[PDB]
Design a protein around this ligand. Structure first.
Ligand SMILES: Nc1ncnc2c1ncn2[C@@H]1O[C@H](COP(=O)(O)OP(=O)(O)OP(=O)(O)O)[C@@H](O)[C@H]1O
Ligand SMILES: Nc1ncnc2c1ncn2[C@@H]1O[C@H](COP(=O)(O)OP(=O)(O)O)[C@@H](O)[C@H]1O
Ligand SMILES: [Mg+2]
Ligand SMILES: [Mg+2]
Lengths: 244, 296
């Protein structure tokens, strides 16, 4: 059935003495496919992943996790990146067994090889607070590289294309995710504002003000909520082309 | 007194020991007390600047070249440009190509070792640093909101009316959330803005940039975190109330640097193109056209 998380009827709040920040959630995330969760700013996008991770409390609803029940090892990189005062290698490995081939495959997935070349002692430099300060796109790529290396089989991603250009975002789009991530069949959820990649989505869930709108596929969004489909056509400005 | 010295010799040696231990702390503080200044005093006499110098932009880039520190390679090479007072020039380029160091050079933050980049008659190196960074405005890529309240995080000086704050937030498009917020005004923003979402933090710091009326207003990647819909709404509400004000935009997305007055692409520290974006689209072999092509 490949139902990764079958949260149904969920109602999630930040404040226990507050309104539910997320309303009724009935998402049906599949396993082994890329899915883009899209809303405006401040409409529950990161709050949904924090809900499915169990970090936010719920007043009702029932999460249905699935393994290969309880939530397994799921890799995740937040909006704000978080670093360890260690080497870049130890930051990306994150207490995993070392593999020189896959550390290479993620260093050319994330394309941090000129940055490790400009790094004054290469792989063994202390970064973070007690260490050399980085630019920020570098830290973002580090936080997604440690998510790549993790062997999670279910990975969560917040937006890595905050502090990247067009080239790094496309290199992270073509290589890395859907290339290193789907040949190993790793379930990936990705929130983004760059709508030019929701073409490459096996599933999309819409969201507005803590409420999810209808979920499904891109041909399903060609049918359902045509206001949102023409809004995504006009926003991507490839309005002549039909998005599939 | 022999009983006294048997009582107090351990106290003498132990108090000497942790006296030396606490003396190490004063040694570290005195080691940080002798750090360098930043030369906040300007060369020009403060009466000789106008009350309203930035009434025109009129920014010339006269052979600017900057480094971070003196042991480093120069970040920007020889660059040569001129900026109209009313125009809406945007800047773009590959990451690590000095486009934020450009903005630091506009605020005399990165080390300027060349350049005559005088803005409306007064020189940058001659200007007092507090008068310079008091009457310009940069918005950053990282939302770095402090603790405290709405009005404190928006205007820590309490130098404006609340209607101006409501207007600068209206052109920041946060009134629906902050009006539904139970404080309304002076609701608590936590230590770092973690109470709100990330792009909401970016919109908050954009609103704090909006309250300062400076007539020179450079933007870094300030739409890099917000969604494209509210980016288009913010883009169509900016350059309408900010029509006279000169904007210098580092656009994270090309589809707002398309509608512009001039554009500079920057790679390897130097200007590659400096003209209208519309003719750069119709060059058919340009870095701007390949940028918008790889975009969409
Ligand atoms: N730490 C928090 N405490 C209280 N409320 C929060 C917190 N984080 C988010 N919220 C509320 O949830 C809403 C959605 O924020 P979320 O966690 O989804 O980040 P996001 O919307 O994905 O980030 P952005 O859109 O800025 O990239 C916000 O409007 C905010 O009101
Ligand atoms: N604090 C710093 N000290 C020394 N060098 C820096 C510092 N910050 C940035 N640099 C260097 O200056 C170059 C200019 O890049 P920068 O302007 O920071 O990014 P972008 O060009 O994407 O805005 C970078 O390649 C970086 O290596
Ligand atoms: Mg978020
Ligand atoms: Mg920058």
């Amino acid at each position: 059935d490949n139902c990764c998380v079958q949260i149904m009827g969920g109602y999630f709040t930040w404040t226990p003495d507050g309104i539910p920040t997320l309303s009724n959630i009935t998402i049906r995330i599949p396993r082994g496919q890329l899915t883009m969760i899209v809303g405006q700013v401040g409409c529950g996008k990161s709050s949904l992943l924090l809900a499915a991770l169990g970090e936010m409390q719920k007043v009702s609803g029932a999460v249905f996790w699935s393994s290969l029940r309880k939530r397994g090892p799921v890799a995740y990189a937040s909006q704000k990146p978080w670093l360890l005062n260690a080497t870049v290698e130890e930051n990306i490995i994150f207490e995993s067994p070392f593999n020189k081939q896959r550390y290479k495959m993620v260093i050319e997935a994330c394309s941090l090889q000129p940055d490790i070349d400009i790094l004054p002692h290469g792989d063994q430099t202390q970064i973070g607070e007690r260490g050399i300060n980085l630019s920020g796109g570098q830290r973002q790529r580090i936080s997604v590289a440690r998510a790549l290396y993790q062997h999670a089989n279910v990975v969560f991603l917040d937006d890595p294309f905050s502090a990247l250009d067009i080239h790094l975002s496309d290199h992270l789009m073509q290589a890395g995710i859907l290339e290193l991530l789907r040949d190993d069949k790793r379930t990936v959820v990705l929130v983004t504002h760059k709508l030019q990649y929701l073409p490459h989505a096996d599933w999309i869930i819409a969201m507005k003000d803590g409420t999810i709108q209808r979920e499904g596929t891109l041909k399903d969004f060609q049918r359902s909520e045509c206001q949102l489909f023409e809004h995504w056509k006009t926003l991507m400005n490839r309005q002549d082309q039909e998005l599939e | 007194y022999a009983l006294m010295v048997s009582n107090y010799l351990n106290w003498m040696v132990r108090n000497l020991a942790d006296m030396e231990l606490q003396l190490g702390a004063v040694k570290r503080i005195h080691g940080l007390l002798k750090t360098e200044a930043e030369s906040y005093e300007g060369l020009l006499a403060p009466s000789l600047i106008p009350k309203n110098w930035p009434d025109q932009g009129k920014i010339q880039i006269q052979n600017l070249s900057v480094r971070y520190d003196s042991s480093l390679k120069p970040v920007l090479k020889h660059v040569n440009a001129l900026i109209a007072p009313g125009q809406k020039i945007g800047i773009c380029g590959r990451t690590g190509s000095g486009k934020s160091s450009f903005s630091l050079a506009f605020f005399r933050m990165v080390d300027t070792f060349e350049g005559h980049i005088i803005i409306d008659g007064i020189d940058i190196a001659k200007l007092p640093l507090h008068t310079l960074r008091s009457r310009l405005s940069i918005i950053l890529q990282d939302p770095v909101l402090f603790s405290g309240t709405i009005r404190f995080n928006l205007d820590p000086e309490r130098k404006c009316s609340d209607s101006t704050l409501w207007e600068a937030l209206e052109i920041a498009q946060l009134k629906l959330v902050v009006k539904a917020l139970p404080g309304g005004l002076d609701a608590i923003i936590t230590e770092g803005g973690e109470n709100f979402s990330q792009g909401q933090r970016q919109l908050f710091c954009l609103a704090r940039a909006f309250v300062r009326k400076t007539s020179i207003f450079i933007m870094d990647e300030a739409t890099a975190s917000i969604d494209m819909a509210t980016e288009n709404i913010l883009q169509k509400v900016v350059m309408t109330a900010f029509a006279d004000r000169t904007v210098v935009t580092i656009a994270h997305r090309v589809h707002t640097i398309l509608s512009a007055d001039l554009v500079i692409v920057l790679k390897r520290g130097a200007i590659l193109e400096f003209d209208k974006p519309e003719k750069l689209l119709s060059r058919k072999d340009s870095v701007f056209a390949s940028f918008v092509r790889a975009d969409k």
